[PDB]
């Protein structure tokens, strides 16, 4: 048998990328645009850590296109992603989306643009 | 067998949603992951495999051996 009822109580990793996929579906347009810029500069170079961006140049960009006023508001509107574990950050000051290149460009083509 | 997997999925035309599932071009590996995540699922309460380090589940251990 396939253990119908027993499959119900137990749970595996499918039972994150898709977790954030619904979060971004419910946000503000400024958050949408800033994450759009993040995902471009992190998908340009599976979305690997080498492909991310530095927060120095990231602030340079989100201030050039006139989105971020300074670093405090930037990190604030970033932690809303962080406070649900919606993007990765390591160190350069790399903010790298651990979500796959496929799923990332899917976000672009479907929910972002 | 992907050939048999398409033999068997479209073998049910009577359902609408299952038919629309049956034309997905990457359905082979998808259903592979489905069957795998049902099998490794039902093979933990049976004791054979152990989900070593829950919250990680990147590797596992085969408890039983034939012997």
């Amino acid at each position: 048998e396939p253990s119908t009822v027993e499959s119900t109580f137990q749970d595996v990793m499918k039972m994150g990328a898709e977790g954030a996929k619904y979060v971004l579906q419910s946000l503000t347009v400024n958050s949408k645009k800033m994450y759009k810029l993040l995902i471009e500069t992190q998908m340009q170079n599976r979305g690997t850590q080498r492909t991310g961006v530095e927060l120095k140049l990231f602030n340079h960009l989100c201030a050039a296109d006139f989105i971020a006023s300074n670093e405090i508001a930037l990190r604030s509107m970033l932690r809303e992603f962080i406070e649900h574990k919606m993007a990765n950050i390591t160190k350069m000051e790399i903010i790298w989306v651990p979500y796959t290149y496929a799923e990332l460009e899917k976000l672009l083509k479907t929910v972002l643009n | 067998p992907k050939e048999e997997i398409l033999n068997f999925i479209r073998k049910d035309p009577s359902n609408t949603k299952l038919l629309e599932l049956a034309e997905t071009p990457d359905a082979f590996d998808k259903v592979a992951l489905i069957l795998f995540m049902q099998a490794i699922f039902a093979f933990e309460n049976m004791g054979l495999i152990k989900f070593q380090s829950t919250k990680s589940y990147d590797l596992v251990e085969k408890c039983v051996w034939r012997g």
Binding site: M13, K14, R46 | K17, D26, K30, L33, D58
Partner: peptide, 19 residues
């Protein structure tokens, strides 16, 4: 030590999976 990680997997929605 490039291991096949379940991240690189074709995910299936709960509906398709269930059905």
């Amino acid at each position: 030590k490039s291991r096949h990680t379940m991240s690189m997997a074709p995910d299936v929605t709960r509906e398709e999976f269930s059905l």
